[PDB]
């Protein structure tokens, strides 16, 4: 018998209280680093170690925008993990999760970029770059990629529950969900300005509501703010 929630790992563009940076040309700092790391290293490095390389890149980057409050600002990513084995994706077999099915799993990419103005939420310029980057990466890593753009909080909950219940999970070895939106600490915005709690999202995939993904790695990437301020950084002693 199993705990209610297990075998999950979650990557965050930023730390509690802080905000995530986005480049209006290139996309978010985090997706750009995440895609760069996974592309080059998925053949010989497990996911946890790989999010450590991503942490390394994010920690060295700084903002460039002379004039604005964003000049030289900083960012720190993080990951939180309940995995119980290595996650090698295999694009070592013995002490790592079974990851051998074709496709490797279903993957969902859920970008909110355009906002209907019910609250004061800005156009996520560069959001289209993030979205494309993740769909190609997940398709290259062997995943059946579902996508979903510009949803309300209600639509998001309902279709994320749909995605969790799909029969296809019975026959695959892993799962991936990537949420890119405006957010607050513990929740992200639908395009209608309404919030969705991340706990509820993770709940829809746990061992009690999503028994078809029991004991297989589930992988959440969350590109949203967790605060209202910017990080000016510290100098090095």
């Amino acid at each position: 018998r199993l705990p209610t929630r297990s075998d999950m790992i979650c990557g965050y563009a930023c730390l509690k209280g802080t905000a995530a940076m986005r480049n209006t040309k290139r996309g978010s700092w985090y997706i750009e680093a995440l895609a760069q790391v996974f592309s080059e290293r998925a053949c010989d490095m497990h996911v946890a170690d790989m999010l450590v390389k991503v942490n390394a890149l994010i920690k060295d980057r700084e903002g460039y925008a002379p004039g604005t409050e964003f000049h030289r600002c900083k960012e720190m990513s993080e990951y939180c993990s309940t995995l119980c084995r290595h996650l090698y994706l295999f694009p070592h077999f013995q002490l790592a999760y079974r990851l051998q099915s074709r496709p490797r799993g279903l993957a969902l990419v859920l970008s909110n970029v355009h906002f209907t103005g019910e609250k004061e939420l800005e156009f996520r310029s560069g959001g289209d770059v993030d979205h494309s980057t993740l769909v190609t990466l997940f398709k290259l890593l062997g995943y059946d990629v579902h996508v979903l753009c510009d949803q309300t909080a209600q639509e998001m909950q309902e279709k994320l529950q749909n995605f969790a219940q799909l029969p296809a999970h019975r026959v695959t070895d892993s799962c991936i969900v990537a949420l890119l939106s405006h957010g607050v600490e513990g929740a992200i915005y639908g395009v209608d300005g309404k919030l969705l709690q991340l706990q509820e999202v993770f709940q829809l995939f746990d061992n009690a509501n999503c028994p078809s993904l029991q004991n297989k790695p589930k992988m959440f990437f969350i590109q949203a703010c967790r605060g209202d301020e910017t990080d000016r950084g510290v100098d090095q002693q």
Binding site: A13, C14, A19, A20, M21, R22, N23, T24, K25, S28, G63, Y64, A65, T68, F70, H71, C73, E122, R124, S125, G126, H182, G183, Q223, A224, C225, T230
Partner: peptide
């Protein structure tokens, strides 16, 4: 060039 999420 920078914008926040």
């Amino acid at each position: 060039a920078x914008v926040a999420x």
